[PDB]
A paper describes a structure:
In a search for putative DNA-binding domains, [name], a protein that recognizes a 19 bp DNA target, was identified. Here, its apo and DNA-bound crystal structures are reported, revealing a central region containing 19 repeats of a helix–loop–helix modular domain ([name] domain; BuD), which identifies the DNA target by a single residue-to-nucleotide code, thus facilitating its redesign for gene targeting. We identified [name] in [name], a symbiotic bacterium found in the cytosol of Rhizopus microspores. Each BuD repeat is composed of 33 residues, only eight of which are strictly conserved between the repeats.
We expressed, purified and solved the structure of this protein, which is able to specifically recognize its DNA target. The models were refined to 2.21 and 2.65 Å resolution, respectively. [name] shrinks 23 Å along the longitudinal axis wrapping the DNA molecule, which displays an almost unperturbed B-form.
Residue numbers in the entry: 15 to 766
The structure:
Amino acid sequence: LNLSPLERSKIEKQYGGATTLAFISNKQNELAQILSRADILKIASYDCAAHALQAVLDCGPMLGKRGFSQSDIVKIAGNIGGAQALQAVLDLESMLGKRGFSRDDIAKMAGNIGGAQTLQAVLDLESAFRERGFSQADIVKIAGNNGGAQALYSVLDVEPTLGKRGFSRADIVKIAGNTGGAQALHTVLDLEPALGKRGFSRIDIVKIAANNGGAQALHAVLDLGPTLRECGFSQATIAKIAGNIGGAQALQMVLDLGPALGKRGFSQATIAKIAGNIGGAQALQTVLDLEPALCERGFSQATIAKMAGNNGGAQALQTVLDLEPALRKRDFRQADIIKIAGNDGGAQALQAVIEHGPTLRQHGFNLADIVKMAGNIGGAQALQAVLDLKPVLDEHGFSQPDIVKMAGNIGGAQALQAVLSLGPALRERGFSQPDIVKIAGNTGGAQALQAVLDLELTLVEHGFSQPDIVRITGNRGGAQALQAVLALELTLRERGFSQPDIVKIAGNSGGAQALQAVLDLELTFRERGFSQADIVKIAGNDGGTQALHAVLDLERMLGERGFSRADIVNVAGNNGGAQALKAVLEHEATLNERGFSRADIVKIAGNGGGAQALKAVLEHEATLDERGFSRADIVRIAGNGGGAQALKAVLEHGPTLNERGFNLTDIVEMAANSGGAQALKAVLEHGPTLRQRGLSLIDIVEIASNGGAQALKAVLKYGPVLMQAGRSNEEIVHVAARRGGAGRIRKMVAPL
C-alpha cells in the first residue's frame, strides 16, 4: 500500500527495518491475502519483523483454517519473538485444544514475550495444574503479563503450602494474575507468618498482594507498620492504606509527611483518610506542597483536608489552585468552587465548569444551576450530558428547570439519557411529561423510569392506576418500591390489605422497606391490640418503617403510663411519628406535672411535627400561663398542625395584638386553627389597615378565625371595591369569614 514517509521512516528505525519494508513490498500480494494494511504495519512495527511476516505467510493460512482470526494472528506475530510464537501455535494448537484451551486462550498466551516457551510450558504442566484443581482460565491468567514458564512453576511451588495456610486457589490466581504476580506469591509465602502475628488477616494479605506492586506493599506493612503503630495508626488503617494500588508508597508518605502535616494542624484521622484512597501518596504530597498557596488564596484547613480526602484528591487540589482565579473572575464565590471540588472527581467537575460554563450561561442556566449540577459526584458528566443532549432535550420539550432538576442529582447524566430513551415510550403509555420529570427527577431516576416501562402493563392489569405508579416511583428509591409492589402484591392482598393501602405504604420514600416491614410485623401488631388499619396508618408516612418499630419498642411503657392503643396510633401515625412517640415518653411526666392530661398530650403530639409541638409547649407554657392563657387554651393552640409555630406566634405577637384591643379569648380563637400562625401575622401586619377602612376588631376576629389569613388578604385586596359598590361590613364579613372565604370574596367582586 501507499506508505507515507512517516509510516516508512517509523519502520526504518527498527532493527532490520529496511528489510521489513522491502519484504512488505516484495510480498505485498501474498500478505494481502491474510492481513489488512493495518495488520501488516502493526507487525512491521517491531524489530526483525521480516521474520515475523515470513512466518505469517508460512503459518497464517493454516491458522485461518484452524479457527484463528486476523486479530489473533497479529497479537501473536506482532511482538518480540513473534516469528517463533506464531510457529509454536501452529505446532501446538491441536494438543492445546485437546486440553480444553480455546483459540482465544492460545492466542492470549502466545501473545506474551517469548510466547513460544509459554505454550510449551503450559503443555508440560497442564496435567499438574489440572490434578491440583486449577482450570484452563486460571492457567491463562497465571501465564499472562509475560509470566511465562516461571510464573507457572512459581504457582506449583507455593500452592500446596499456601493451601495449608488457608489460601484459596482463587486467592492464588488473583495474586498471580498481575505483573510480577509470581514474585508476589513467594513474598506472600515468606511474609504471611509475620503478617499474621502482627495482626493482619488472610483477606488483608491477599488484598494487599493482589495489586501491582503488591510484594513491595507487603514488605512496607512489616517494615513501616511498627513505626506507624507508634504514631497511633491501627492495623485496620494500615491494611486499608496498603490495600490500594501504590499502597507501599502511600504508607511511606504517611511516615514521611505525617509529622509535618500534623504540625500544620491536620489530625491523624484526616491523614489516614487522605492516604486510604487510590493515589493517597500523591494526595498527601500535594497537600503538603499546595496547602500554603491554597491558604494564601483563602481556603480553610478543613476545606483543603476535605478536597484531599476524596478519590482524585491530588488532582482536585492542583486543579483548584489553577482554576480558582478564572472561576472567581466569573463571579463564582469560594464556597461554590469548594462545593464543586469537594466530591470524587472534583477536578474534572471544575474543568467541566470552566469548559462548558460559558455555553451553559448562554442556554439560560445561571451560576446556581451550574453549581447544583456540577456539585455532585459525576458532576463533570452531568454538565457534559446537558450540552450533548440539549438539542434533543429541546425537541422533546423539556424546560430548563426540568433539566436542572434531573441532572442536579447524583447520576444526573444517566437520568438525562434515560429520559430521552424511555420518555417517548412512557408518553405513549399515557404518562404525562411532568410525571416523567418527577420520576427521573430523583437519584436512581434512570432505574425508576425503566421500572415503570417494565412493570406498568402488569400493575395496571392488577388494578393499580398510572397515577399510583407515578406516586410510588416518583420518590427516591422509586424503582425498588415499584419492584417491591410487584413482588409482594399477592401476599399483602391475601393478608387483607387493599390496593390503596399498598399504594399508600409504597408511595413514600423508604416504601420498599415499609411494605416488607408490614409483612414482617403484622402478626406482632395484631397480638398487641392494633388493627390492620392502624398498621397502614403508621407505615403510610415518610419513615413508616421507623414508625412501626418505634411503636413495637415503646407501646408497653406508653400503655402502662395511661395511653390507649388509639392514642399510640394517632401519635405515631403522622410524619415524624417515631420522634413524636419518643417525645411523648420523654415528656409525659413533666407535662402531667404542669397540668396537661393524657388526652392533652395526645392532642398536641398527634399531628405532624408533634414532637416540636410538645417541645414548644414545655418551653412556653410558663410564660403563657403568666400572661393569662389557660391550659386548655394552650392545648387548642398547640393541638393542630403547625402548633409549635402557632404557639410561638401568640408568644411573639400576642402582647402587641392585646395592646391594640384584641382580648386573649380572640387571640386564642385566631390561633387555635391550622394556619393560626399565618392568621396572627396577617392580623398583625394588615389589621390596622382594615381597621382604618372601617372594619371593627370583632369583624377582624371573625374573618381571621373562620377564613384565616387567606380571607383577610382577600378582604384587604378587594374590600375597598366592594364597599364602593354598596356592600356593608356585615356582608363582607359573612362572605369572607368561612373556609374558602377568599374564593367567596373573588366571586362577589368579579363583576367590578
